[PDB]
DNA sequence: TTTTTTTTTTTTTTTTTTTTTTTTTTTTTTTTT
DNA sequence: AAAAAAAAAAAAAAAAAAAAAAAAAAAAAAAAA
């Protein structure tokens, strides 16, 4: 959302952007596609992700948060590993 | 072939034995 | 016009004595109808018994799952991985219901996907199914059926004694997803109140259940996966134990066997479609007259000979395998009707014994070539059955390639394979041939040939040329005589095999577009006129019908069709011509070949390309 | 039949012949009774109209049986009519429930209680204009599975098995028959689903003020080779043809009632070419 | 472990190639994001192009199309009321690994036609 | 055996839900530059 | 290839038709005498 100026996203776009990070993380090497899909579904049913109202892995979405809420979550999270905390800055 | 003409030819040759 | 072409109604009732065995008695008392009924009921009961013996193990597992849930919140569910052929499956579930009504372990509701368009209809169908299942084992309205009434009914009936509440969903893929998720949430909320077991009917894979059940829904799920045996395996079992069983006198030919197995293995994995195609083949065979009613065992066929009429001998005279029996002998055969009446039982026992020796020789040769690598003739009994009824098996180069590869092995593997073949053929002769009538002469003819084979094995194990002697003796006493084709068959073998394949091919597999294409390309194939003939399929002669000319005239044009040049070219080929062209474009739009586009003032688009 | 895919990617004696064809197809009727006795259904898929063949089968063979003849080519047919017909007229059980699959459940439960009571149904054009949805074919395939109910049906469209899956095709235990007559589609294509003289006949019934109003519209349309509402209202008001604006809206709604001028968004375009409007303008002089 | 018939396998990989492979390129590849939609005429055209046996268009083939829709291996993005009229649009709803398994058990390479 | 009371079923009337018409707004196609 | 109209299609509101429920009325069964 910060790169493409709040364009609607997808499971495949976010999974590609996550899998580019998970190859060099040395902590998230062993996550499957289905576990990240279940995590995406858990974010969807908690309404941190809302549909624009297509297959489940291809339905378009919107982020229901602001950037300041995620920036405060990065400071308030307990036992956050440093790889994720460094990936959140850039 | 037809069964009628084959039966007729076989019967006629059976009379020709 | 007609009485039924009314402008107001669409349906017309011709009720004659209707209130709140189609044929007459003259067709049923004919012997071929009784023989066809007996043979079809025997084959259908055998196929049903085989399917029961296939399904009984997974049935016992599901019944033990329901009982072990009863001996014990998340709800216990059980994905039953069935095949893609849905109409074969529901009857299986019915059997489970009967066993669940045997031990009084549960009562079963079945939720079809047609009844569960919404959550309200799904819950109403569930409660109504459970209440009427209890009412039928030992009436609420549609809007009255609620989960509160189910809880009160279960407290009033089965809290003093617990019956599980098994909910069977036979078509898991065809459900609405949100209705299914909310139904699983509704059933999981009432755990502890009502003991629910959820049996699923998943047809594809477990990836479908893992995809359509989200995180929060599958958090309340304790599923245990069961597996059903595959539909090609069930087909091969039915073909091994029923269609090649020696105790039926009705045989299929190689081409019809290959046609039905091609329909199964290539188009649809439906065992019921195979059963109905085989029933149509058996019906089309036995519905040729009372002469084909002799296709049973020996005593009933001898009785049917003793009751036979004159026209039945006249239609067994016309079949093509009868004439070389005449030419090999004459004045009493062709017309006198009693020489054949006393000569028939020898021919009947000859064909019966030939088919029994054919089945035994097929068993011997499929054990001999079955463990061989590279399989030039096939692995199972059925492919060898097709290749052995189709053509001369020794004149085929595949048997010579088989002999070349059997000569390339050692003596130990050859000796072990022929001993396994001897033991299997003797076991098949003692188990399945021995209770069969006219089976004593079968063993008494084929067994000294097996003694010759076994003594050849004895001389090759006592002492390279004896291996070739064993191979040529296997050829000479099994493959030559007891493994003939259908062209080298005995006399009058038509009564027992069924080779009519073009009529059955037209009447089972439906090709509407082939008939429409033929009737619009050359109407001479159907009209059979002495004027509308065509040398090639695009001549466009003047004596053609109207719609054929309009179809040929729009067939060569592009995608978009104008009314003007098409009408002018139709006038160039063939007032009332405008009414005929309006009739032609109406009939050709009626078949789906073109379409008048909406407010494109005269231009019409062809939907066929 | 093999259609070639590249075209998608680059984009008298006749009467006696039909009489012999119909006698040949009338020979198949005891075979059809023997086939319908064993549980199969009959499907015909020829080119020509199979209406008369099925009607002659109903007259010559099924003369005393309970026969529900359904015209699938009827554009005002619904499944409610057929199910109300079966539940009310044959079974005497009143109106069928509004859920049609529940009505088929009721029909199966009621036909289970009456064996040796066979309902034949003859559906001309099973792919008819109101049976081309999947629900109606599901209802018809569920009806065809009942051992008391027997089915004969016609097929005319080229895309018919696109709505029969393998479950419907195992419920429809069809015996396919090539009954290709050469009869034209008179009874099937006659119904509702398949001019300057009309403009003059409508203009005959106009009054004087409506004649002047349509005269102004056609004169402006032919002068400028649609027209606005304001200049039309000023043209009707300068000639004393109208009292207010709502009477012009009433007269223009009367014109749109008869399909003479077309409203657009108010643009007023007459949907006939300029040459015939020029002939009509020269017709009054 | 989804067992299918032979022509159902070929129709399924033809539907995958119809949804994936960029319908402007169909003019070149056979004549000799998201899954894009297609019509059943395009599916039958690609099926006859990649089968190279030219089987008859019987009722069982279109019944296989309807029961692959029914088994949720395909879907109906558009249409569903003009299914015979040519305006119905389908979409393929499987992945690449299943198509590669089908092409391996048949012997037909999909990556050549990809 | 005849009369009166209370149950049951049918028919009518009212309410609620589903379908259909109608108006508005959007939206993909078509003509002009 | 873009700007702009234009007809077709979708959304939504509003009214009617049909289904369902509830009450009134008539027929039937069982008690009163």
In residues, how long is chain A? Answer: 90
Distances (CA, A) of C207 to C230, C288, D190, D223: 18, 51, 51, 71
Experimental technique of record: cryo-EM
Query: What is the rounded distance in angstroms from the CA atom of residue C240 to the CA atom of residue C465?
Result: 36
Backbone phi and psi for residue C46, each to the nearest 5 degrees, phi listed first: -70, -40
**Distance, C-alpha D105 to centroid of its chain:** 29
Nucleotides of G under 7 A from a protein CB: 6-9, 18-21
- Of D126, D176, D119, the C-alpha closest to D148 is D119
| Residue C563 burial by Cβ neighbours in a 10 Å radius (0-12, 13-18, 19+) | middle
Q: Are C184 and C167 in contact (CB under 8 A)?
A: no
Q: Are C253 and C498 in contact (CB under 8 A)?
A: yes
Q: Are E16 and E22 in contact (CB under 8 A)?
A: no
Query: What is the rounded distance in angstroms from the CA atom of residue D43 to the CA atom of residue D174?
Result: 6
- Of E33, E20, E25, E5, the C-alpha closest to E90 is E20
Local structure of residue C432 (DSSP, 8 states): I
Strands C77-81 and C196-200, how do they pair? parallel
Query: What is the rounded distance in angstroms from the CA atom of residue E27 to the CA atom of residue B11?
Result: 68
Q: Which helix (H) or strand (E) holds C548?
A: helix C546-555
Contacts of C328 (CB under 8 A, 6+ apart): none
- Of C268, C83, D165, D131, the C-alpha closest to E70 is D165
Instruction: Tell me the shortest Cα–Cα distance from E95 to chain A, in angstroms.
Output: 11
Structure tokens, C262: 């091609």
Structure tokens, C300: 């009933």
Whether C513 sits with its Cβ under 7 A from any strand G atom: the answer reads no
Q: Degrees (nearest 5) of the Cα angle A28, A33, A34? A: 115
Chain breaks in chain B (C to N over 2.5 A) after: none
**Distance, C-alpha D201 to centroid of its chain:** 29
Strands D41-44 and D150-154, how do they pair? parallel
Query: What is the rounded distance in angstroms from the CA atom of residue C279 to the CA atom of residue C568?
Result: 54
Q: Degrees (nearest 5) of the Cα angle D180, D182, D183? A: 115
CB atoms within 10 A of CB D243: 11
- Of D141, D199, D198, D213, the C-alpha closest to D172 is D141
Query: What is the rounded distance in angstroms from the CA atom of residue D260 to the CA atom of residue D196?
Result: 10
Inter-chain contact C269–E61, Cβ cutoff 8 Å?
no
Query: What is the rounded distance in angstroms from the CA atom of residue E26 to the CA atom of residue E16?
Result: 13
| Residue C2 burial by Cβ neighbours in a 10 Å radius (0-12, 13-18, 19+) | exposed
Query: What is the rounded distance in angstroms from the CA atom of residue C217 to the CA atom of residue C189?
Result: 11
> What region does C439 belong to: left with phi over 0, alpha with psi -120 to 50, or beta?
alpha
- Of E72, E103, E108, the C-alpha closest to E90 is E72
Query: What is the rounded distance in angstroms from the CA atom of residue C154 to the CA atom of residue C113?
Result: 25
Query: What is the rounded distance in angstroms from the CA atom of residue C302 to the CA atom of residue C41?
Result: 22
Strand-pair partners of E92:
E74
Contacts of D35 in chain C (CB under 8 A): 283
Query: What is the rounded distance in angstroms from the CA atom of residue C364 to the CA atom of residue C377?
Result: 14
Q: Are C429 and C360 in contact (CB under 8 A)?
A: yes
Q: Does C591 touch chain E (CB under 8 A)?
A: no
Local structure of residue E3 (DSSP, 8 states): -
Query: What is the rounded distance in angstroms from the CA atom of residue C75 to the CA atom of residue C189?
Result: 9
Q: Which chains touch A (3 or more CB pairs under 8 A)?
A: C, E
3-state secondary structure C476-494: HHHHCCCCCCCCCCCCCCC
Backbone phi and psi for residue A17, each to the nearest 5 degrees, phi listed first: -65, -30
| Residue C511 burial by Cβ neighbours in a 10 Å radius (0-12, 13-18, 19+) | buried
Contacts of D239 (CB under 8 A, 6+ apart): D212, D216
Distances (CA, A) of E108 to E9, E52, E74, E101, E113: 11, 11, 21, 10, 9
Query: What is the rounded distance in angstroms from the CA atom of residue C190 to the CA atom of residue C167?
Result: 13
3-state secondary structure C189-231: HCCCCCCEEEEECCCCCHHHHHHHCCHHHHCCECCCCEECCCH
CB atoms within 10 A of CB C560: 11
Whether D78 sits with its Cβ under 7 A from any strand G atom: the answer reads no
Backbone phi and psi for residue D267, each to the nearest 5 degrees, phi listed first: -85, 135
Query: What is the rounded distance in angstroms from the CA atom of residue C376 to the CA atom of residue C397?
Result: 10
CB atoms within 10 A of CB C203: 23
| Residue D200 burial by Cβ neighbours in a 10 Å radius (0-12, 13-18, 19+) | exposed
CB atoms within 10 A of CB C223: 19
Q: Degrees (nearest 5) of the Cα angle C14, C16, C22? A: 95
Resolution reached, in Å? 3.2
Nearest to D33 among C23, C526, C608 (CB): C23
Q: Is C604 helix (H, G, I), strand (E, B) or coil?
A: strand
Query: What is the rounded distance in angstroms from the CA atom of residue C518 to the CA atom of residue C453?
Result: 57
Q: Are C81 and C228 in contact (CB under 8 A)?
A: yes
Query: What is the rounded distance in angstroms from the CA atom of residue C95 to the CA atom of residue C87?
Result: 14
Query: What is the rounded distance in angstroms from the CA atom of residue D93 to the CA atom of residue C102?
Result: 35
Nearest to A45 among C210, C211, C216 (CB): C216
Q: Are C548 and C593 in contact (CB under 8 A)?
A: no
Q: Which helix (H) or strand (E) holds A51?
A: strand A49-51
Rounded (10°) angle between helices D208-223 and D245-257: 80
CB atoms within 10 A of CB C527: 25
């Amino acid at each position: 959302s910060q790169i493409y100026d709040r364009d609607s996203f997808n499971f495949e776009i976010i999974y590609a952007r996550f899998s580019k990070f998970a190859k060099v993380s040395t902590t998230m090497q062993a996550v499957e596609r289905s576990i990240v899909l279940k995590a995406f579904e858990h974010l969807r049913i908690a309404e941190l992700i809302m549909p624009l109202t297509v297959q489940k892995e291809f339905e378009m979405h919107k982020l229901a948060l602001t950037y300041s809420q995620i920036h405060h979550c990065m400071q308030r999270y307990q036992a956050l590993p440093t790889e994720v905390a460094q990936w959140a800055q850039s | 072939e037809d069964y009628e003409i084959w039966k007729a030819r076989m019967l006629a040759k059976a009379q020709a034995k | 016009m007609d009485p039924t072409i009314s402008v107001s109604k669409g349906c017309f009732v011709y009720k004659n004595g209707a209130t709140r065995s189609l044929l007459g008695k003259e067709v049923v008392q004919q012997p071929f109808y009784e023989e066809y009924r007996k043979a079809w009921n025997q084959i259908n009961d055998h196929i049903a018994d085989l399917q029961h013996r296939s399904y009984a193990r997974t049935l016992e597992q599901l019944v033990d799952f329901v009982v072990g849930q009863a001996e014990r919140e998340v709800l216990p569910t059980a994905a039953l991985l069935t095949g893609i052929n849905q109409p074969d499956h529901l009857s299986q579930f019915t059997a489970l219901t009967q066993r669940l009504h045997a031990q009084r372990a549960a009562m079963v509701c079945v939720l079809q996907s047609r009844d569960c368009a919404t959550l309200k209809a799904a819950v109403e169908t569930l409660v109504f199914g459970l209440v009427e299942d209890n009412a039928e084992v030992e009436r609420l309205r549609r809007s009255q059926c609620t989960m509160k009434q189910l809880k009160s009914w279960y407290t009033n009936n089965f809290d003093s004694e617990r019956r599980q509440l098994v909910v069977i969903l036979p078509d898991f893929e065809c459900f609405n997803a949100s209705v299914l998720q909310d139904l699983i949430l509704i059933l999981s909320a009432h755990c502890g109140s009502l003991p629910f077991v959820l049996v699923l009917g998943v047809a594809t894979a477990m990836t479908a259940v893992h995809g359509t059940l989200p995180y929060h829904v599958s958090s309340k799920i304790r599923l245990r996966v069961f597996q059903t045996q595959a539909a090609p395996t069930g087909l091969n079992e039915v073909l091994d134990k029923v269609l090649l069983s020696p105790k039926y006198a009705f045989h299929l030919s190689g081409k019809t066997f290959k046609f039905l197995t091609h329909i199964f293995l290539y188009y649809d994995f439906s065992i019921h479609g195979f059963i109905q195609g085989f029933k149509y083949c058996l019906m089309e065979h036995f519905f040729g007259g009372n002469a084909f009613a002799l296709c049973t065992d020996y005593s009933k066929a001898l009785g049917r000979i003793k009751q036979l009429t004159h026209e039945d001998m006249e239609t067994i005279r016309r079949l093509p395998s009868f004439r070389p029996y005449v030419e090999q002998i004459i004045i009493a055969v062709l017309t006198d009707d009693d020489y054949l009446k006393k000569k028939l039982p020898q021919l009947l026992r000859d064909c019966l014994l030939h088919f029994l020796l054919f089945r035994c020789s097929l068993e011997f040769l499929t054990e001999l070539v079955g463990d061989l690598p590279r399989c030039p003739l096939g692995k199972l009994r059925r492919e060898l059955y097709v290749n052995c009824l189709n053509r001369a098996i020794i004149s085929t180069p595949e048997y010579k390639e088989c002999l070349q590869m059997l000569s390339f092995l050692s003596k130990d593997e050859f000796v072990a394979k022929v001993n396994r073949a001897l033991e299997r053929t003797e076991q098949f002769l003692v188990e399945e041939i021995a209770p069969l009538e006219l089976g004593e002469a079968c063993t008494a003819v084929l067994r000294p040939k097996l003694e010759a084979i076994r003594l050849a094995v004895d001389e090759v194990v006592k002492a390279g040329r004896a291996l070739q002697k064993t191979l040529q003796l296997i050829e000479t006493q099994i493959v030559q005589d007891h493994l003939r084709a259908l062209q080298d068959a005995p006399p009058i073998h038509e009564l027992f095999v069924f080779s009519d394949i073009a009529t059955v091919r037209r009447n089972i597999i439906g090709a509407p577009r082939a008939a429409l294409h033929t009737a619009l390309n050359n109407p001479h194939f159907y009209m059979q006129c002495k004027c509308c003939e065509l040398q090639d399929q695009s001549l466009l002669v003047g004596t053609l019908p109207d719609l054929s000319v309009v179809y040929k005239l729009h067939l060569e044009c592009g995608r978009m069709i104008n009314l003007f040049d098409w009408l002018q070219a139709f006038r160039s080929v063939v007032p009332q011509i405008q009414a005929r062209f309006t009739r032609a474009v109406a009939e050709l739009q009626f078949l789906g070949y073109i379409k008048m586009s909406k407010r494109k003032t005269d231009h019409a688009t062809r939907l066929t390309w | 039949f093999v259609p070639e895919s590249d075209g998608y990617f680059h984009s008298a004696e006749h009467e006696g012949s039909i009489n012999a064809i119909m006698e040949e197809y009338r020979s198949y009727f005891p075979k059809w009774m023997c086939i319908l006795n064993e549980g199969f259904n009959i499907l015909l898929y020829g080119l020509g109209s199979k209406h008369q063949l099925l009607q002659s089968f109903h007259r010559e063979v099924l003369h005393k049986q309970t026969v529900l003849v359904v015209n699938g080519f009827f554009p005002s047919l619904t499944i409610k009519d057929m199910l109300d017909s079966i539940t009310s007229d044959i079974l005497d059980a009143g109106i069928s429930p509004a859920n049609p699959h529940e009505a088929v459940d009721m029909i199966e439960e009621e036909f289970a209680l009456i064996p040796e009571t066979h309902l034949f149904l003859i559906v001309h054009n099973l792919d008819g204009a109101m049976l081309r949805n999947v629900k109606a074919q599901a209802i018809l395939s569920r009806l065809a599975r009942i051992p008391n109910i027997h089915l004969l049906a016609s097929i005319d469209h080229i895309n018919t098995p696109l709505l029969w899956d393998q479950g419907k095709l195992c419920s429809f235990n069809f015996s396919w028959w090539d009954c290709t007559t050469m009869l034209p589609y008179t009874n099937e294509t006659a119904f509702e689903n398949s001019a300057l003289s009309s403009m003059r006949s409508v203009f005959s019934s106009l009054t004087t003020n409506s004649r002047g109003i349509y005269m102004l519209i056609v004169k402006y349309q032919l002068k400028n080779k649609g027209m606005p509402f304001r200049d039309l209202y000023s043209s009707c008001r300068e000639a004393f043809l109208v009292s207010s604006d709502l009477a012009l809206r009433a007269q223009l709604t009367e014109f749109l009632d008869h399909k003479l001028v077309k409203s657009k968004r108010e643009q007023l375009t007459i949907p006939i070419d300029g040459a015939l409007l020029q002939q009509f303008l020269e017709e009054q002089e | 472990s989804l067992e299918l018939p032979y022509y159902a396998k070929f129709l399924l990989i033809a539907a995958f190639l119809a949804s994936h492979n960029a319908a402007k390129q169909d003019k070149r590849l056979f004549v000799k994001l998201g899954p894009k939609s297609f019509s059943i005429d395009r599916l039958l055209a690609i099926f006859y192009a990649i089968l190279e046996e030219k089987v008859g268009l019987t009722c069982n083939l279109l019944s296989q199309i309807s029961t692959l829709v029914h088994l949720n291996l395909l879907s109906f993005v558009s249409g569903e009321q003009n299914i015979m009229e040519g305006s119905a649009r389908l979409q393929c709803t499987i992945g690449l690994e299943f198509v590669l398994q089908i092409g391996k058990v048949v012997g037909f390479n999909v990556r050549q036609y990809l």
